[PDB]
Design an enzyme around this catalytic site. Structure first.
Site, PDB file in Angstrom:
ATOM      1  N   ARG A 151     -32.281 -20.898   0.245  1.00 51.43           N
ATOM      2  CA  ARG A 151     -33.694 -20.460   0.169  1.00 51.43           C
ATOM      3  C   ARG A 151     -34.549 -21.056   0.911  1.00 51.43           C
ATOM      4  O   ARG A 151     -35.960 -21.021   0.796  1.00 51.43           O
ATOM      5  CB  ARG A 151     -33.938 -20.356  -1.306  1.00 51.43           C
ATOM      6  CG  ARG A 151     -33.645 -19.024  -1.984  1.00 51.43           C
ATOM      7  CD  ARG A 151     -33.036 -19.630  -3.451  1.00 51.43           C
ATOM      8  NE  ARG A 151     -32.398 -18.527  -4.197  1.00 51.43           N
ATOM      9  CZ  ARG A 151     -31.311 -18.268  -3.932  1.00 51.43           C
ATOM     10  NH1 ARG A 151     -30.485 -18.833  -3.250  1.00 51.43           N
ATOM     11  NH2 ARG A 151     -30.955 -17.045  -4.648  1.00 51.43           N
ATOM     12  N   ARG A 255     -27.173 -13.597 -10.878  1.00 52.20           N
ATOM     13  CA  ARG A 255     -27.150 -12.341 -11.499  1.00 52.20           C
ATOM     14  C   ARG A 255     -25.856 -12.402 -12.414  1.00 52.20           C
ATOM     15  O   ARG A 255     -26.115 -11.871 -13.717  1.00 52.20           O
ATOM     16  CB  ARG A 255     -26.722 -11.303 -10.085  1.00 52.20           C
ATOM     17  CG  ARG A 255     -26.462  -9.856 -10.660  1.00 52.20           C
ATOM     18  CD  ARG A 255     -26.594  -8.787  -9.596  1.00 52.20           C
ATOM     19  NE  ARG A 255     -25.281  -8.916  -8.609  1.00 52.20           N
ATOM     20  CZ  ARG A 255     -24.550  -7.952  -8.633  1.00 52.20           C
ATOM     21  NH1 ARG A 255     -24.945  -6.664  -9.179  1.00 52.20           N
ATOM     22  NH2 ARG A 255     -23.344  -8.089  -7.897  1.00 52.20           N
ATOM     23  N   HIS A 327     -12.625  -4.955   0.495  1.00 49.53           N
ATOM     24  CA  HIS A 327     -13.207  -5.101  -0.778  1.00 49.53           C
ATOM     25  C   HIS A 327     -13.174  -3.926  -1.098  1.00 49.53           C
ATOM     26  O   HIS A 327     -13.463  -2.827  -0.341  1.00 49.53           O
ATOM     27  CB  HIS A 327     -14.535  -5.412  -0.212  1.00 49.53           C
ATOM     28  CG  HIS A 327     -15.614  -5.015  -1.222  1.00 49.53           C
ATOM     29  ND1 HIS A 327     -16.330  -3.881  -1.481  1.00 49.53           N
ATOM     30  CD2 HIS A 327     -16.110  -5.899  -2.202  1.00 49.53           C
ATOM     31  CE1 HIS A 327     -17.204  -3.899  -2.243  1.00 49.53           C
ATOM     32  NE2 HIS A 327     -17.093  -5.089  -3.065  1.00 49.53           N
ATOM     33  N   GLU A 357     -11.494   1.885 -10.026  1.00 45.66           N
ATOM     34  CA  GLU A 357     -11.598   2.516  -8.638  1.00 45.66           C
ATOM     35  C   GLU A 357     -11.006   4.229  -8.943  1.00 45.66           C
ATOM     36  O   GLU A 357     -11.250   4.915  -8.274  1.00 45.66           O
ATOM     37  CB  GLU A 357     -10.844   1.963  -7.908  1.00 45.66           C
ATOM     38  CG  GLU A 357     -11.240   1.988  -6.430  1.00 45.66           C
ATOM     39  CD  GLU A 357     -12.278   0.930  -6.368  1.00 45.66           C
ATOM     40  OE1 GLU A 357     -12.720   0.320  -7.236  1.00 45.66           O
ATOM     41  OE2 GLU A 357     -12.657   0.908  -4.927  1.00 45.66           O
ATOM     42  N   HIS A 360     -13.605   6.438  -9.987  1.00 43.61           N
ATOM     43  CA  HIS A 360     -14.597   6.896  -8.949  1.00 43.61           C
ATOM     44  C   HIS A 360     -13.775   8.226  -8.499  1.00 43.61           C
ATOM     45  O   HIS A 360     -14.420   9.213  -7.913  1.00 43.61           O
ATOM     46  CB  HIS A 360     -14.796   6.028  -7.866  1.00 43.61           C
ATOM     47  CG  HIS A 360     -15.811   4.979  -8.260  1.00 43.61           C
ATOM     48  ND1 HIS A 360     -17.131   5.216  -7.600  1.00 43.61           N
ATOM     49  CD2 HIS A 360     -15.641   3.632  -8.792  1.00 43.61           C
ATOM     50  CE1 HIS A 360     -17.870   3.963  -7.998  1.00 43.61           C
ATOM     51  NE2 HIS A 360     -17.091   3.243  -8.897  1.00 43.61           N
ATOM     52  N   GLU A 384     -20.984   4.457 -10.887  1.00 44.43           N
ATOM     53  CA  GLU A 384     -20.224   3.390 -11.001  1.00 44.43           C
ATOM     54  C   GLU A 384     -20.335   3.206 -12.759  1.00 44.43           C
ATOM     55  O   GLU A 384     -19.394   2.337 -13.214  1.00 44.43           O
ATOM     56  CB  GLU A 384     -21.333   2.185 -10.709  1.00 44.43           C
ATOM     57  CG  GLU A 384     -20.844   1.544  -9.460  1.00 44.43           C
ATOM     58  CD  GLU A 384     -19.531   0.757  -9.561  1.00 44.43           C
ATOM     59  OE1 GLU A 384     -18.176   1.247  -8.875  1.00 44.43           O
ATOM     60  OE2 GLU A 384     -19.333   0.031 -10.739  1.00 44.43           O
ATOM     61  N   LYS A 463     -39.706 -14.982 -13.749  1.00 48.35           N
ATOM     62  CA  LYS A 463     -38.230 -15.557 -13.962  1.00 48.35           C
ATOM     63  C   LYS A 463     -38.245 -16.342 -15.202  1.00 48.35           C
ATOM     64  O   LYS A 463     -37.557 -16.060 -16.206  1.00 48.35           O
ATOM     65  CB  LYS A 463     -37.732 -16.466 -12.841  1.00 48.35           C
ATOM     66  CG  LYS A 463     -36.400 -15.939 -12.294  1.00 48.35           C
ATOM     67  CD  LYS A 463     -36.195 -16.932 -11.095  1.00 48.35           C
ATOM     68  CE  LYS A 463     -34.564 -16.284 -10.515  1.00 48.35           C
ATOM     69  NZ  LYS A 463     -34.286 -17.123  -9.380  1.00 48.35           N
ATOM     70  N   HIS A 487     -28.367  -7.129  -2.356  1.00 49.34           N
ATOM     71  CA  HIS A 487     -29.023  -5.720  -2.532  1.00 49.34           C
ATOM     72  C   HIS A 487     -30.651  -5.652  -2.169  1.00 49.34           C
ATOM     73  O   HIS A 487     -31.073  -4.784  -2.158  1.00 49.34           O
ATOM     74  CB  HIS A 487     -28.750  -5.460  -3.829  1.00 49.34           C
ATOM     75  CG  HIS A 487     -27.322  -5.007  -4.264  1.00 49.34           C
ATOM     76  ND1 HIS A 487     -26.582  -5.929  -4.345  1.00 49.34           N
ATOM     77  CD2 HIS A 487     -26.951  -3.992  -4.859  1.00 49.34           C
ATOM     78  CE1 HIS A 487     -25.255  -5.208  -4.854  1.00 49.34           C
ATOM     79  NE2 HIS A 487     -25.582  -3.905  -5.201  1.00 49.34           N
ATOM     80  N   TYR A 497     -27.871  -0.848 -11.295  1.00 46.80           N
ATOM     81  CA  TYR A 497     -26.835  -1.544 -11.994  1.00 46.80           C
ATOM     82  C   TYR A 497     -27.503  -1.856 -13.736  1.00 46.80           C
ATOM     83  O   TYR A 497     -26.838  -2.160 -14.345  1.00 46.80           O
ATOM     84  CB  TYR A 497     -26.812  -2.895 -11.218  1.00 46.80           C
ATOM     85  CG  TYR A 497     -25.757  -2.918 -10.399  1.00 46.80           C
ATOM     86  CD1 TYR A 497     -26.403  -2.324  -8.986  1.00 46.80           C
ATOM     87  CD2 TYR A 497     -24.426  -3.164 -10.474  1.00 46.80           C
ATOM     88  CE1 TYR A 497     -25.133  -2.539  -8.015  1.00 46.80           C
ATOM     89  CE2 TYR A 497     -23.553  -3.319  -9.409  1.00 46.80           C
ATOM     90  CZ  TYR A 497     -23.834  -2.607  -8.267  1.00 46.80           C
ATOM     91  OH  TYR A 497     -22.919  -2.787  -7.361  1.00 46.80           O
TER      92      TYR A 497
END
EC number: 3.4.17.23
Lengths: 597, 194
Positions: A151, A255, A327, A357, A360, A384, A463, A487, A497
């Site tokens: 950062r 996250r 991925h 998967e 999907h 998802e 935060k 993201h 999400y």
């Protein structure tokens, strides 16, 4: 001779034509994610603009049919995804500035070159590097440099570069008759025109704020337990009454808390449920992972996999002579072709994503009869969520009891599933405020609620009020702290999400009530019960033709996004978390600072 | 015993598109439908009014073998009383149809890697088709209140759109060679049996 019949013949042209030029684009992208070659990377860019300059000629021709008189709702939800002008609302030199700045924020995030001035002789790459240092490094200052320098060299050059981004993406939205760009991410949850099932964009902020207020005591008791279990690891670095520091949450930003399981385990004397040592002894291969992933899907009622799936896909990493970026993404190439692509290995966390998967694909195999502009999820967080419930039922000890992985004589006491539910708490519950706060910050910098000099003071104060995290170094406005993510920098909607979590347990409340399960939710198995497949296939085949609030009423019986099934999934955890938190102090204060020296 | 030319409507090199389906008047020979069905090299076979157990017993005067090629989920449309895309603009069977379709999947000899744009199918038309009618026309389909003079620009679209045939698609969209066998009777003496 009317505008309804004019839009039907135009969309009938469009679907068919689009199918030809979507396959041709997606097959060149499938050949890029299998053969990384300089000869093949130009074939993706040649098939990519042929669909991009096709959708630009088709959206201008779709703007001549007004939506003010089209009455059939299937046609209107088709043209609403086509009459959107996209990023082409600006002028010439202003919009090319948008395109050339996405290529300098996406390339500066993946290729961030940072290291230490103490020893700059040999430096770092993010993978295998700064993601590994958030896993097996348990030092304070060694993780402080690992989090502050990302950062201070990546977020430094994005802070005067994303101030131009927020004033330019508002012009992409205020020409499309929106309030800000924040309404464009909220525009996919828009439902208008159907009686009784309306959903405005401004109601989504009031709906997440009512669902987060109910998971507020659940996330707080994790925060009173993670902090109490990190006191022994760091003796004088975490205050008992304050919040948690940022650079010890186990991830690159904070996250997911999956890497914090090995330090805050509830019962380490009992073994965690794993079948990695069970799959290698049974000579399981890459084919039998997806063979028994299919035997879960044909045993719920859902259709069998196509014959083109087992011949055109790629399951094993094809040697060290060609690079295949694997991925795990599930590829709908269109036109009946549904391939899959992941370098699957014989581990449990690889086997568990095989059920996710194919969820999907089994969603995408269901709306194949739908038109092309509605071949998508009900919303952007809907695809998802329908996959993870298939992985959530394949992780139960009752399902692995069936396919021969687990032992025939397996004990299961009351201290066993608490170690499993904390594994699901650190990946699903702990990311729920971290998804809400990052999206509440984005919605409050797109609306102009905070200017340049206040751009970061209402981030750490967002935060250490919502997610309970205090940043260890006093940051000025020269850093853009949310700009260091996958993201945020790559311009993707992040509220998908949050909504994925509240659908992936609301669907499991509905399927297990149809599968006649007598017990808690985390032991439920929707396999071998075809009553729950038909309650799912009535949603899976709709796609985007039916609104998302009627795709929820078709499954769970509630038109809105509820939160009580998620809290009911963690009911043996919430009771146990209150049993051990008598000696700690619940809640936190906004006063504690590690830099209060 | 001379066999009917069923070697030229099944094992042919190329078939015609569904907008230009060629009608072969098979006559003055001895059939053996049995061969096809029985050796089952071919697949679906469904009849109405006649049946293969009664096929080689009674005979007709002129059998019409109409061969075309369609997609996978469009074989269901070649049926009596069916509405859709092929069955309303390309090939409609009458309500009293007395023959059977024979559809076999042809992904080996008919689909080419990276595009087979040699087969066309009709997508728009001014009205539905009469039974057993073929329209070979490229006139531009007026879908607006503006008379277009041949250019396919805005709301004046080209009627024939091209099948894409990649090997990899799906049973859903693989090329399916379909030949019907329209049996009928006249005052003429019946020839095709033995």
């Amino acid at each position: 001779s009317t505008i309804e019949e004019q839009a039907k013949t135009f969309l009938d042209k469009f679907n068919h034509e689009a199918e030809d030029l979507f396959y041709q684009s997606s097959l060149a992208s499938w050949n890029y994610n299998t053969n990384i070659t300089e000869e093949n990377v130009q074939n993706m860019n040649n098939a990519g603009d042929k669909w991009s300059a096709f959708l630009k000629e088709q959206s201008t021709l779709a703007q001549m049919y007004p939506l003010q008189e089209i009455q059939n709702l299937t046609v209107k939800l088709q043209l609403q995804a086509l009459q959107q002008n996209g990023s082409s609302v600006l002028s010439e030199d202003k919009s090319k500035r948008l395109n050339t700045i996405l290529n300098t924020m996406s390339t500066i995030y993946s290729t961030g070159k940072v290291c230490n001035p103490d020893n700059p002789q040999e430096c770092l790459l993010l993978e295998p590097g700064l993601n590994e240092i958030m896993a097996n490094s348990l030092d304070y200052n060694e993780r402080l440099w690992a989090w502050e320098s990302w950062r201070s060299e990546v977020g430094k050059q994005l802070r005067p570069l994303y101030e131009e981004y927020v004033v330019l993406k508002n012009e992409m939205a205020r020409a499309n008759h929106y309030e800000d760009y924040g309404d464009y991410w909220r525009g996919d949850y828009e439902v208008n025109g159907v009686d009784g099932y309306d959903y405005s964009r401004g109601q989504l902020i009031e709906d997440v704020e009512h669902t987060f207020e109910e998971i507020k005591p659940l996330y707080e008791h994790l925060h009173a337990y993670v902090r109490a279990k990190l006191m022994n690891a760091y003796p004088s670095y975490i205050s008992p009454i304050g919040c948690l520091p940022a650079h010890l949450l186990g991830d690159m930003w904070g996250r997911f808390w999956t890497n914090l399981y090995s330090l805050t385990v509830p019962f380490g004397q009992k073994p965690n449920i794993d079948v990695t040592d069970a799959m290698v002894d049974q000579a399981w291969d890459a084919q039998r992972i997806f063979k028994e992933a299919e035997k879960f899907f044909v045993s719920v009622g859902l259709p069998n996999m196509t014959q083109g799936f087992w011949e055109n896909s790629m399951l094993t990493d094809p040697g060290n002579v060609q690079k295949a970026v694997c991925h795990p993404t599930a590829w709908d190439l269109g036109k009946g072709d549904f391939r899959i692509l992941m370098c699957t290995k014989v581990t449990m966390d690889d086997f568990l994503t095989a059920h996710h998967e194919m969820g999907h694909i089994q969603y995408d195999m269901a709306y194949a009869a739908q038109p092309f502009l509605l071949r998508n999820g009900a919303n952007e967080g809907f695809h998802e969520a329908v996959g993870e419930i298939m992985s959530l039922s394949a992780a139960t000890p009752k399902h692995l009891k069936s396919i021969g992985l687990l032992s025939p004589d397996f004990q299961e006491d009351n201290e066993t599933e608490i170690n499993f539910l904390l594994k699901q708490a650190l990946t699903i519950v702990g990311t729920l405020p971290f998804t809400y706060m990052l999206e509440k910050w984005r919605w409050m910098v797109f609306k102009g609620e905070i200017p340049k000099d206040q751009w970061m003071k209402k981030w750490w104060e967002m935060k250490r009020e919502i997610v309970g995290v205090v940043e260890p170094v006093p940051h000025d406005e020269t850093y853009c702290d949310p700009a260091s993510l996958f993201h945020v920098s790559n311009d993707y909607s992040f509220i998908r999400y949050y909504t994925r979590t509240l659908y992936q347990f609301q669907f499991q409340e509905a399927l297990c009530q149809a599968a006649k399960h007598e017990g808690p939710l985390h032991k439920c198995d929707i396999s071998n019960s075809t009553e729950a497949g038909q309650k799912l296939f009535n949603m899976l085949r709709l796609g985007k033709s039916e609104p998302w609030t009627l795709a929820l009423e078709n499954v769970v019986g509630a038109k809105n996004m509820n939160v009580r099934p998620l809290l009911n999934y963690f009911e043996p955890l919430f009771t146990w978390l209150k049993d051990q938190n008598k000696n700690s102090f619940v809640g936190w204060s906004t006063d504690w600072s590690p830099y209060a020296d | 015993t001379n066999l009917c030319p069923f070697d030229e409507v099944f094992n042919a090199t190329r078939f015609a598109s569904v907008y230009a389906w060629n009608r072969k008047r098979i006559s003055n020979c001895v059939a053996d439908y049995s061969v096809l069905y029985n050796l089952a090299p071919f697949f679906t076979f469904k009849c109405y009014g006649v049946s293969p157990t009664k096929l080689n017993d009674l005979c007709f005067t002129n059998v019409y073998a109409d061969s075309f090629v369609i997609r996978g989920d469009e074989v269901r449309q070649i049926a009596p009383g069916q509405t859709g895309n092929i069955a309303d603009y390309n090939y409609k069977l009458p309500d009293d149809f007395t023959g059977c379709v024979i559809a076999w999947n042809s992904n080996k000899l008919d689909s080419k890697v990276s595009g087979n744009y040699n087969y066309l199918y009709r997508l728009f038309r001014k009205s539905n088709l009469k039974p057993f009618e073929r329209d070979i026309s490229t006139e531009i389909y007026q879908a607006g209140n503006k008379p277009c003079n041949g250019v396919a620009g805005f709301n004046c679209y080209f009627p024939l759109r091209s099948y894409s045939f990649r090997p990899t698609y799906g049973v859903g969209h693989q090329p399916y060679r379909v030949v019907v066998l329209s049996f009928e009777l006249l005052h003429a003496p019946a020839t095709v049996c033995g």
